[PDB]
Structure formats: structure tokens, C-alpha cells
Amino acid sequence: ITEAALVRDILYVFQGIDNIKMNCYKVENLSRSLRDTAVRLSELGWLHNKIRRYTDQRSLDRSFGLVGQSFCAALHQELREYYRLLSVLHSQLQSLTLRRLLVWTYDPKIRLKTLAALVDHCQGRKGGELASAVHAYTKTGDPYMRSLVQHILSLVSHPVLSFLYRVASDP
Amino acid sequence: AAAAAANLNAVRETMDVLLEISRILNTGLDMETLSICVRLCEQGINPEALSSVIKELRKATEALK
Amino acid sequence: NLNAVRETMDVLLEISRILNTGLDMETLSICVRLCEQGINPEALSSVIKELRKATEALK
Amino acid sequence: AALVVDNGSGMCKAGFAGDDAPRAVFPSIVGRPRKDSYVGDEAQSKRGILTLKYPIEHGIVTNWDDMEKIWHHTFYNELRVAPEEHPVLLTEAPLNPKANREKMTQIMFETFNTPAMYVAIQAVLSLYASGRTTGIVDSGDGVHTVPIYEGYALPHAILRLDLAGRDLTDYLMKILTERGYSFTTTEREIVRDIKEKLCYVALDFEQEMATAASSSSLEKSYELDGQVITIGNERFRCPEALFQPSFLGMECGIHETTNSIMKCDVDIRKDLYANTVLSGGTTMYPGIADRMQKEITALAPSTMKIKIIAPPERKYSVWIGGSILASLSTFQQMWISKQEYDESGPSIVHRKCF
Amino acid sequence: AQELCLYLTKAASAPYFEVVEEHEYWDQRYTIVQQQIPSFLQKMADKILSTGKYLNVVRECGEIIYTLKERAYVEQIEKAFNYASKVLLDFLM
Amino acid sequence: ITQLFDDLCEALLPAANRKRAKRSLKKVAYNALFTNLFQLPARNKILMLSFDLRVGGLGPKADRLEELVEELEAVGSVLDLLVQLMDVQSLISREECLCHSMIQETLQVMEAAPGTGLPTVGL
Amino acid sequence: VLLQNLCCRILGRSEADVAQQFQYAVRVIGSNFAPTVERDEFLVAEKIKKELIRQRREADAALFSELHRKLHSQGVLKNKWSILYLLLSL
Known part of the structure; x- marks a missing residue:
């Protein structure tokens, strides 16, 4: 199995579409130096699933509220960009290798680390209680995360400040 | 030199012939105004649009006089 | 009056946005208030283009 | 350096x-x-x-x-x-x-x-500080209206007024003393402070005098040894001397002196009227710019565009x-x-x- | 390796210099912890605690760089504590 | 006026010595202000720019530029300072230059001499 | 800027004075910039002769034919259709 063939499948495992198959993306031959680097790279694609399932399962039911939409519709502007990176990486496959990917995808291994762990801390929260559980992620100090989550808060807290400028009501 | 003076002659001719076609057609234009309307028509401009303007500014200069 | 001078200052941002001038909101209020003093605007066109020039030599 | x-x-x-x-x-x-x-x-x-x-x-x-x-x-x-x-x-x-x-x-x-x-x-340096090379400019401690065109002061049109900050300080000592206090000793330093902190130029002298005579709305307190004194119409009467030197026994005010413009070539007078710049510590009084605007407008042709420039940093311009x-x-x-x-x-x- | 360990401490200190522990009648609100003292600010361990403390009894009512043999930050703290009191002391008179 | 030039010099200063550059940039503000001083209506200059708008399309925008200067009448020297300073095919041609300006900005570093684009190796 | 000189030639004024008309001239010229009909100097010529003949001025209809050739002889005019289409209208 050539190294180029692995670079062909990995660019798909970054999305969910599976040599590399589906919780770790167990790869199934080739030398040990190749399987190890694929394993870590393939697993980044698995994260992308956990963040995609939420923005697809909750984009189905109509009883998630008005805040749960501006959150589920702010996890997409932070995904189109992840679809622009996959665009660029594919145009060069026609040269890049495994050891060259690690530096390319070292940063989106973190943004896909906060978002894939921001949708688990707020699972059953709807309404304002969700805008209060994506604010408990700002007390972090890490200048790269505190400047990412402090942007999703600026979108999730827009519907809340829409009622206010216009608290449980009773029908 | 010379080719820069031969062009200033071939333009004073044409600007003198267009002034003849202008008087036998009895357009109210004169030698000064007519040199503006020629320059405009060189760059490419609708004479159906440019003539509506002149037919208007001349129609408003009377309400002020 | 401060409500009027806010609107007149807010409209003036757009005509500086579609004219593709690099002036952001802060540098605009600086230049508007400075032009409001009475300085000739033909000179201000040169200081901004030079401050932006020496700023680029750093980067 | x-x-x-x-x-x-x-x-x-x-x-x-x-x-x-x-x-x-x-x-x-x-x-x-x-x-x-x-x-x-x-x-x-x-x-x-x-x-x-x-x-x-x-x-x-x-x-x-x-x-x-x-x-x-x-x-x-x-x-x-x-x-x-x-x-x-x-x-x-x-x-x-x-x-x-x-x-x-x-x-x-x-x-x-x-x-x-x-x-x-x-005066030329102050004009430069305002971003101009043409205009008419300076009231300091012991002593000008200086017309400047294209960076050059016009000596024939420059006027000197021997009335400035020092005279105003002494005048304030005099009227505060007439009020019932007593500021006469080299007290001059204290009054200079009162002057720089509480004085202002009234837009209309008479109206301001009437307000001060019928109410305490213009009064300000000043603390010395702890004694707190009151300064009333003296706040604006002091700098009023710049506009009416007769209050000091002197025979023209700063607005009238700013005569300098009329001594310049008629072709540059409008540039001066539109660029009258104030400089010096004695031009720091609140309200002086608006008062100058009003007074000059009264002296100049009705069709003249008048503009008084008073830079916030004019004390050191x-x-x-x-x-x-x-x-x-x-x-x-x-x-x-x-x-x-x-x-x-x-x-x-x-x-x-x- | 002295340009490096200055690049870390310049970035590992922005969170601290943007905020001494608090509690929940007023001498037990904020109290100095003795261990976590930089031992080059030990000279001013009391003016720091006294500087922010005055800012809170008014708030609820209604840049620094490290250099060696140069005290540009020790002087920078005194320039703020000398204002921290002049806003509260005047607030009570 | 001596301060309004000091606040102007702060805005155009890009955020990060920031204490001496402001002292030197205030020179470039004064060294350039007095060159013009040593050495025509207002609304007409907008129309001459309104014309050039309509020619290259975008008519309604030009009908807006004139819509505001008509209400700004009921200040003239301020606008005199501003004048001094296929819908789908363009989409697919933008998201293609990005992938040309994203694989280039990083392949110019991935393949070079060891230690060129790296800033820590430059120490 | 050239449209504003025209408004100062026809109406005798300065550009600071006449600005309502120049607001009406940008409305018409703009959005009507591109030429709408196919351009040919032949058809426009056979309509300036047909017009000077209609006024019993048959002598100037054969003089124009000698002035329209000189325009081609010198060759400093790129669009000869436009300037004739306009001179005929006025």
C-alpha cells in the first residue's frame, strides 16, 4: 500500500466518510510507522462526527427553542471554514505527505476539540439555560479558546437580548 | 513639430464644416457650444439622450430670463 | 444636539465606505472633528497616505 | 535631539x-x-x-x-x-x-x-501647530495680533497690546478686594490661581452682570488656611478687560485689535477672518472663542465668513x-x-x- | 534561551495582570496569600492588596512588563494606588 | 486644535514602540500639513463621481449618494474632504482563488531550506 | 467632470451655482450610457442629405458629401456615427 493512497483516504476520514474504516478509525499490509500516524489523523475526523450529529439531530425537532437555533446555526459558520480547509488540502493531493499534514492540521485539532466538547457540556439545556452553559466556558484563560467561545456567546445571547429589549412565562 | 501642426489644421477644417451643416439646419448652436457636443460624441454617447438634455436646458433658460 | 450630530456623523460613514476609503469609525471622528476646526482638507489627504506608508515599513 | x-x-x-x-x-x-x-x-x-x-x-x-x-x-x-x-x-x-x-x-x-x-x-509657530501657514494669530503674561500669510508674518499689520495675564491678575486682586476681601501682597499668586481656575468670558457682559446681581447661580467657592471664599461676577468681570481695557484705565480690546486684518492686503483678509487662531495662556478662559466670534462678526462685513480656532493645547502651541x-x-x-x-x-x- | 523564557512569561502573565484571593466583615473579603508572592514584588505586597480593595467598595456602590535592575513596574503600581485612594477618599467626603 | 491632531495620530497608529512613534508620526503630520498651505462648488464634485458610478452599472447606489446630500442640506467643507480620498461565476472564481492562496501560502514554507519560514530558528 | 462644463456652457453660470440641472443631467446620461442601436455612418449620412433636400437646399446636400469625406481623410475621429447622429438631432 503506497503512502499516497493513505493521503487519499485520510482526506475523506476528516469528514466521516471512510482502507480506513470506522470508536477509533481502525485502519486495516503497511509498515507500523504509517498506521500510527493515520490513527491520530483519522480520529480527528471522528470528532467532526460528534459535532455534526448534534447540529443534525437538533435541527430536526421543532421544540428546541429560539436560543437553541442561534447555537445550532452558529456551529455551522464554524464548519464552513472547516470545509474550506478540506478544499485547499484536496487541490494539492494531485505534493503533501503524512508528516506534512500534521503541521497543516495541528490548529484545527483544537477548534474541533473545544466545539466537540462544547456540545456535550450543554446537552439538555434549552432556552436561556443554554446561553448560561456556553458562558461557563469563558473562564478558561487560554487566549485561543477564550476568544473563540466568547464569539459563540455573542451569537447565542442575541435572542436572549431580544426578549429583554422587548423569565418563565405561564400560558 | 510638423505632424502636431498638421493635426491642428485638419481639426479647424472639420470644425468649420460642421458649423456649416449646423446653420443650414438652423440649430441654435454656435462655434463654442458645438465643440462641446462634438467631444462628447467622440467618446460614445446616445445622441437621443444628449439631445434631450440640450432640448431641456434651453427650455429652462427661458423661465429664468 | 448630540442626537443630531450623531446621525449626521453616522450617515457620513457610509459615503466613506462605498467610496472605498480606509477610514474606520474611530479615525473618521478624529478627522471629522479635525476638519471641523478649519484645517484645509487638501493637506489631510497627504498625512493619512503617509502615516499609512510609514506604518507599512514596520510590517 | x-x-x-x-x-x-x-x-x-x-x-x-x-x-x-x-x-x-x-x-x-x-x-x-x-x-x-x-x-x-x-x-x-x-x-x-x-x-x-x-x-x-x-x-x-x-x-x-x-x-x-x-x-x-x-x-x-x-x-x-x-x-x-x-x-x-x-x-x-x-x-x-x-x-x-x-x-x-x-x-x-x-x-x-x-x-x-x-x-x-x-505666533508663526502657533499657527503651524494648528496645521496652517496662513491666518491671524497671542495673549501671554506680559504682552499681539499677528497676520501671517504663507508662513510669513506681516510686520506692517502686527499690533501690540500691552494688556495680558499679569494685568488681569492684578485687576482680579483689585475687584476681589473691593468685594470685601483683601488681596494685595505678592496674595497675587493665590489670585492668579483663582483666575486660572474659576474665571470665564461671558457671552454678554450686561446679561451676565444682571444674572449675578439677582441670584447666586454664578458663584463659585475657592478654598485658601481653610477659609472658603466666594467669587461672583468677578469670574467674568476680570477677563472682560480684554474686550474693554477701559476697566483698567487703558484707552482697543482684543476683538477690535484683531484692525490688524484691515491693515493687510484686501485679497487675503478673508483668509484671515476664516483663520483667526488663539494662543497663549490668557486665551484659555472658557467662553473666549464664542465671544470673539460674536464680536468679530459685529465688526466685519455681514457677508464675511468668520471662524475662531481655539486649540485645546493652545497654552503651549x-x-x-x-x-x-x-x-x-x-x-x-x-x-x-x-x-x-x-x-x-x-x-x-x-x-x-x- | 533568555529570549524564549521571556516570551513565555510575557504571555503566561496576561491573565494574572488582567485581574490575592477573595472570600464571601471587610478584612476577610480579600486576604494576601503568603506563599504565592513573586519575591520581587514582596516590597509592595500591601499596596497591591490595598489598591484593588478600594476599587470594590465603590464599584458595588455605583500595561506592565518585567525588567531586570529596572523598576519601571514598581513605579507603575504606585501611580495607580495613588489614584485608587483619591477616588474613594473623595467619595466619602 | 493642538490636541485634535494628537488624537488623530493615535487612531491611524496600528495597535501592537507606541511611545516614540507617535512623537515621530506627529512630525509627518506637520511636515506634510504646511506643504499645501505654502503653495468651484461642492455638490458638483459628487455628481462627477455619481456619473462614473452609473456608467459601470450599479444605478441605485448612485441614486442613493445623491439622496443623502439632498437631506444633508437641511458641513459643506466636510464632503469636500471625502471626495479627495455573472453573479454566480464570480462566486466560483472566489472560492477557487482561496484554494490557490491557501495551498500556496503553506507549500512555500513546507518545501524550502530548513529554517527559513520558521521564526524560532531565526533566533 | 465633462458633463458639468456643458451645463456651464449652455447655462451661463459657475459650477457652484447650477447644481439642480446637473443633478438632472446625471439622471439621464447615467443609466443610458451604452449605445442602443447598431452604429453605421452610412445610414446617418443618407438622412442628412434627405433632410437638406427636403428644404429645397439641394446645393448644401452635395457640399456635405464633400465635408463627410474629409472627416475620413484626416482620421482623428474614432466614432463618426455618434457626432453626426447628434448634429442631425439639434
């Missing part, structure tokens, strides 16, 4: 070209016992045991021996630099006698051995203008070098500093 030294009738301002403000400001005084010579704040602090001299009392240097001491003080005490190591830009009053310009030049090169120097008119000028690329060729001085002598200043 080049030095910028603003020689004031009451306060000298000194610093380095390129800076936004002077590094030092001190009284233009030299004192000797009634350490042999005292200059600046120290002379003032120990005035009790000294006889004070004011070598540039009205803007023009009258005693060069003490002026030299003020400059020595400026370099070695205030700025802590050696003049022989830095070019020096000095300021001068409008209508400064030609002989004085040569004297200043000779002293800088021969006494202080400056590597380079230049002298500029105070002379110095700031010097800092700006000395920092200009095109100005470097304008300095008088020690070489040029050795070649042509003191009189070169007339050609180099026109």
Missing part, C-alpha cells in the same frame, strides 16, 4: 524637538541676594531673600546678562544637556528688533557654542509648533550651522531666519 526653547515674558518652555510637550516650564526670572544667582522656580521660592529681575518682561529681551543666565539654566538645570551638543530652536516675539536677533545668534554660537540654531516668531518645525525633513537644511556662522557672522540670521 534638537532643543526647542520658547522664551516667554513670564514663563519659559523648554524641551526636545519631536516631543508632544515641553519637558520643563519655569518663571523667566533671575534673582540675586538682597550660589550667587537664582533662576526659575528657585528664584521665586526664595524671592524673600532676593532681588528679582525680569529680563524679558514684555516679550523683548532687555537685559542680556540675565537672559544668558536663563538660557544657561535652561540647558544645564532644566534639560540637563550640553548646548554645544544639540541644535537649538529659539522663539522670539513679533516685531523683535533686528539687533536683538543678531545678539541671540551670537550668544548661541559664541557663548554656548551651539552646533546649530534657528529663531522663529512665536508656540512650543509645540517649534517641536513640529524642528522635526520637519525640509527644515533641516534651514538650520544655521556653526560653519555658516563662522562664514557670515551674526547678521546671517536675517537671511536664514526671514
Whole structure:
């Protein structure tokens, strides 16, 4: 199995579409130096699933509220960009290798680390209680995360400040 | 030199012939105004649009006089 | 009056946005208030283009 | 670094070209016992045991021996630099006698051995600081309306008014005393403070007097030893003297003097009217810009566009203008070098500093 | 490796210099912890605690760089504590 | 006026010596202000720019530029300062230059001499 | 800027005075910039002769034919259709 063939499948495992198959993306031959680097790279694609399932399962039911939409519709502007990176990486496959990917995808291994762990801390929260559980992620100090989550808060807290400028009501 | 003076002659001719076609057609234009309307028509401009303007500014200069 | 001078200052941002001038909101209020003093605007066109020039030599 | 030294009738301002403000400001005084010579704040602090001299009392240097001491003080005490190591830009009053310009030049090169120097008119520097080269400008401590066109002051149209901050301070002492208090002693320093902090120029004198006479709405308190005193119509009556010198027994106000414009060529008068710039500590009174606007408008043709420019930093606009000028690329060729001085002598200043 | 360990501490200190522990009648609100003292600010361990403390009894009512043999930050703290009191003391008179 | 030039010099200063550059940039403000001082209506200059708008399309925007200067009448020297200073095919041609300006900005570093684009190796 | 000189030639004024008309001239010229009909100097010529003949001025209809050739002889005019289409209208 050539190294180029692995670079062909990995660019798909970054999305969910599976040599590399589906919780770790167990790869199934080739030398040990190749399987190890694929394993870590393939697993980044698995994260992308956990963040995609939420923005697809909750984009189905109509009883998630008005805040749960501006959150589920702010996890997409932070995904189109992840679809622009996959665009660029594919145009060069026609040269890049495994050891060259690690530096390319070292940063989106973190943004896909906060978002894939921001949708688990707020699972059953709807309404304002969700805008209060994506604010408990700002007390972090890490200048790269505190400047990412402090942007999703600026979108999730827009519907809340829409009622206010216009608290449980009773029908 | 010379080719820069031969062009200033071939333009004073044409600007003198267009002034003849202008008087036998009895357009109210004169030698000064007519040199503006020629320059405009060189760059490419609708004479159906440019003539509506002149037919208007001349129609408003009377309400002020 | 401060409500009027806010609107007149807010409209003036757009005509500086579609004219593709690099002036952001802060540098605009600086230049508007400075032009409001009475300085000739033909000179201000040169200081901004030079401050932006020496700023680029750093980067 | 080049030095910028603003020689004031009451306060000298000194610093380095390129800076936004002077590094030092001190009284233009030299004192000797009634350490042999005292200059600046120290002379003032120990005035009790000294006889004070004011070598540039009205803007023009009258005693060069003490002026030299003020400059020595400026370099070695205030700025802590050696003049022989830095070019020096000095300021001068409008209508400064030609002989004085040569004297200043000779002293800088021969006494202080400056590597380079230049002298500029105070009013011109203030205009530069406002971003202009044309306009009419200066009220300080001991003494001008200066029309300037394209960077050149017009000497024939310059007017001098021997009425400034010092006179206003003494007038305030007088009217506060008439009120029932008593400010008469070299108390003058206290009143100067009251003046700088609580005075203002009324838009309309009579209306303001009527308001103060029928209510306490214009009164302000000032604390001395703890005694709190009240200042009423004196707040605006004091600076009113700038507009009506008769209050001081003097026979024109600053608005009328700003006559200077009428002495200029008719073709540049509109530029002056549209660019009347205020400078100096005595132009710091709140309300002075609007009052000038109103008064000039009354004197000028109804069709004239009048604009009074009052920079927030006008108290030091002379110095700031010097800092700006000395920092200009095109100005470097304008300095008088020690070489040029050795070649042509003191009189070169007339050609180099026109 | 002295340019490096200055690049870390310049970035590992922005969170601290943007905020001494608090509690929940007023001498037990904020109290100095003795261990976590930089031992080069030990000279001013009392002016820091006293500087922010005055800012809170008014708030609820209604840049620094490290250099060696140069005290540009020790002087920078005194320039703020000398204002921290002049806003509260005047607030009570 | 001596301060309004000091606040102007702060805005154009890009955020990060920031204490001496402001002192030197205030020179460039003064060194350039007095060059013009040493050496025509207002609304007409907008129309001459309104014309050039309509020619290259975008008519309604030009009908807006004139809509505001008509209400700004009921200040003239301020607008005199401002005048001094296929819908789908363009989409697919933008998201293609990005992938040309994203694989280039990083392949110019991935393949070079060891230690060129790296800043820590430059120490 | 050239449209504003025209408004100062026809109406005798300065550009600071006449600005309502120049507001009406940008409305018409703009959005009507591109030429709407195919351009040919032949058809426009056979309509300036047909017009001077209709006024019993048959002598100037054969003089124009000699002035329209000189325009081609010198060759400093790029669009000869436009300037004739306009001179005929006025």
C-alpha cells in the first residue's frame, strides 16, 4: 500500500466518510510507522462526527427553542471554514505527505476539540439555560479558546437580548 | 513639430464644416457650444439622450430670463 | 444636539465606505472633528497616505 | 535631539524637538541676594531673600546678562544637556528688533557654542501647530495680533497690546478686594490661581452682570488656611478687560485689535477672518472663542465668513509648533550651522531666519 | 534561551495582570496569600492588596512588563494606588 | 486644535514602540500639513463621481449618494474632504482563488531550506 | 467632470451655482450610457442629405458629401456615427 493512497483516504476520514474504516478509525499490509500516524489523523475526523450529529439531530425537532437555533446555526459558520480547509488540502493531493499534514492540521485539532466538547457540556439545556452553559466556558484563560467561545456567546445571547429589549412565562 | 501642426489644421477644417451643416439646419448652436457636443460624441454617447438634455436646458433658460 | 450630530456623523460613514476609503469609525471622528476646526482638507489627504506608508515599513 | 526653547515674558518652555510637550516650564526670572544667582522656580521660592529681575518682561529681551543666565539654566538645570551638543530652536516675539536677533545668534554660537540654531516668531509657530501657514494669530503674561500669510508674518499689520495675564491678575486682586476681601501682597499668586481656575468670558457682559446681581447661580467657592471664599461676577468681570481695557484705565480690546486684518492686503483678509487662531495662556478662559466670534462678526462685513480656532493645547502651541518645525525633513537644511556662522557672522540670521 | 523564557512569561502573565484571593466583615473579603508572592514584588505586597480593595467598595456602590535592575513596574503600581485612594477618599467626603 | 491632531495620530497608529512613534508620526503630520498651505462648488464634485458610478452599472447606489446630500442640506467643507480620498461565476472564481492562496501560502514554507519560514530558528 | 462644463456652457453660470440641472443631467446620461442601436455612418449620412433636400437646399446636400469625406481623410475621429447622429438631432 503506497503512502499516497493513505493521503487519499485520510482526506475523506476528516469528514466521516471512510482502507480506513470506522470508536477509533481502525485502519486495516503497511509498515507500523504509517498506521500510527493515520490513527491520530483519522480520529480527528471522528470528532467532526460528534459535532455534526448534534447540529443534525437538533435541527430536526421543532421544540428546541429560539436560543437553541442561534447555537445550532452558529456551529455551522464554524464548519464552513472547516470545509474550506478540506478544499485547499484536496487541490494539492494531485505534493503533501503524512508528516506534512500534521503541521497543516495541528490548529484545527483544537477548534474541533473545544466545539466537540462544547456540545456535550450543554446537552439538555434549552432556552436561556443554554446561553448560561456556553458562558461557563469563558473562564478558561487560554487566549485561543477564550476568544473563540466568547464569539459563540455573542451569537447565542442575541435572542436572549431580544426578549429583554422587548423569565418563565405561564400560558 | 510638423505632424502636431498638421493635426491642428485638419481639426479647424472639420470644425468649420460642421458649423456649416449646423446653420443650414438652423440649430441654435454656435462655434463654442458645438465643440462641446462634438467631444462628447467622440467618446460614445446616445445622441437621443444628449439631445434631450440640450432640448431641456434651453427650455429652462427661458423661465429664468 | 448630540442626537443630531450623531446621525449626521453616522450617515457620513457610509459615503466613506462605498467610496472605498480606509477610514474606520474611530479615525473618521478624529478627522471629522479635525476638519471641523478649519484645517484645509487638501493637506489631510497627504498625512493619512503617509502615516499609512510609514506604518507599512514596520510590517 | 534638537532643543526647542520658547522664551516667554513670564514663563519659559523648554524641551526636545519631536516631543508632544515641553519637558520643563519655569518663571523667566533671575534673582540675586538682597550660589550667587537664582533662576526659575528657585528664584521665586526664595524671592524673600532676593532681588528679582525680569529680563524679558514684555516679550523683548532687555537685559542680556540675565537672559544668558536663563538660557544657561535652561540647558544645564532644566534639560540637563550640553548646548554645544544639540541644535537649538529659539522663539522670539513679533516685531523683535533686528539687533536683538543678531545678539541671540551670537550668544548661541559664541557663548554656548551651539552646533546649530534657528529663531522663529512665536505666533508663526502657533499657527503651524494648528496645521496652517496662513491666518491671524497671542495673549501671554506680559504682552499681539499677528497676520501671517504663507508662513510669513506681516510686520506692517502686527499690533501690540500691552494688556495680558499679569494685568488681569492684578485687576482680579483689585475687584476681589473691593468685594470685601483683601488681596494685595505678592496674595497675587493665590489670585492668579483663582483666575486660572474659576474665571470665564461671558457671552454678554450686561446679561451676565444682571444674572449675578439677582441670584447666586454664578458663584463659585475657592478654598485658601481653610477659609472658603466666594467669587461672583468677578469670574467674568476680570477677563472682560480684554474686550474693554477701559476697566483698567487703558484707552482697543482684543476683538477690535484683531484692525490688524484691515491693515493687510484686501485679497487675503478673508483668509484671515476664516483663520483667526488663539494662543497663549490668557486665551484659555472658557467662553473666549464664542465671544470673539460674536464680536468679530459685529465688526466685519455681514457677508464675511468668520471662524475662531481655539486649540485645546493652545497654552503651549508656540512650543509645540517649534517641536513640529524642528522635526520637519525640509527644515533641516534651514538650520544655521556653526560653519555658516563662522562664514557670515551674526547678521546671517536675517537671511536664514526671514 | 533568555529570549524564549521571556516570551513565555510575557504571555503566561496576561491573565494574572488582567485581574490575592477573595472570600464571601471587610478584612476577610480579600486576604494576601503568603506563599504565592513573586519575591520581587514582596516590597509592595500591601499596596497591591490595598489598591484593588478600594476599587470594590465603590464599584458595588455605583500595561506592565518585567525588567531586570529596572523598576519601571514598581513605579507603575504606585501611580495607580495613588489614584485608587483619591477616588474613594473623595467619595466619602 | 493642538490636541485634535494628537488624537488623530493615535487612531491611524496600528495597535501592537507606541511611545516614540507617535512623537515621530506627529512630525509627518506637520511636515506634510504646511506643504499645501505654502503653495468651484461642492455638490458638483459628487455628481462627477455619481456619473462614473452609473456608467459601470450599479444605478441605485448612485441614486442613493445623491439622496443623502439632498437631506444633508437641511458641513459643506466636510464632503469636500471625502471626495479627495455573472453573479454566480464570480462566486466560483472566489472560492477557487482561496484554494490557490491557501495551498500556496503553506507549500512555500513546507518545501524550502530548513529554517527559513520558521521564526524560532531565526533566533 | 465633462458633463458639468456643458451645463456651464449652455447655462451661463459657475459650477457652484447650477447644481439642480446637473443633478438632472446625471439622471439621464447615467443609466443610458451604452449605445442602443447598431452604429453605421452610412445610414446617418443618407438622412442628412434627405433632410437638406427636403428644404429645397439641394446645393448644401452635395457640399456635405464633400465635408463627410474629409472627416475620413484626416482620421482623428474614432466614432463618426455618434457626432453626426447628434448634429442631425439639434
